[PDB]
Amino acid sequence: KVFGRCELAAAMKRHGLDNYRGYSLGNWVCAAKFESNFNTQATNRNTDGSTDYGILQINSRWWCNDGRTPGSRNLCNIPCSALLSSDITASVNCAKKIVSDGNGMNAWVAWRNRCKGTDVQAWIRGCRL
Ligand SMILES: [Cl-]
Ligand code: NA
Numbered sequence: 001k002v003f004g005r006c007e008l009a010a011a012m013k014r015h016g017l018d019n020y021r022g023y024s025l026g027n028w029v030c031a032a033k034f035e036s037n038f039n040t041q042a043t044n045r046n047t048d049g050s051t052d053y054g055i056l057q058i059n060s061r062w063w064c065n066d067g068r069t070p071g072s073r074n075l076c077n078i079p080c081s082a083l084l085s086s087d088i089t090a091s092v093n094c095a096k097k098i099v100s101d102g103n104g105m106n107a108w109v110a111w112r113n114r115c116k117g118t119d120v121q122a123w124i125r126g127c128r129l
Pocket of ligand 1: 021022103104105
């Protein structure tokens with residue numbers, strides 16, 4: 001499923017991401033836009049052999065199991081395919097574990113390079129939340 005900007009903002013808010021660990025909703029919507037262009041089915045292979053899955057491009061090296069990433073961890077205890085669902089619950093729950101890991105949202109390269117330090121509030125403007 002390809003989410004609309006405000007539709008995703010509402011979905012994330014409902015799942016408790018607004019201000020989660022101090023990150024305003026705009027940060028999460030901005031991260032989703034540049035990681036997957038709001039597409040839940042996005043996948044991207046990395047040079048190390050791991051793959052990123054879903055709306056927030058969660059990596060199979062540490063967070064989910066895809067059966068093809070040797071010596072990898074499954075910290076979110078879920079098959080990576082679950083992260084491609086139209087229902088973002090799995091992605092949100094796993095993202096909460098990731099952002100609490102100690103490096104905050106810096107774990108998402110796109111957020112660090114394209115959202116961090118910008119006016120992220122603009123990503124939820126005009127939305128009925
Ligand atoms: Cl932080
Ligand atoms: Na894994």
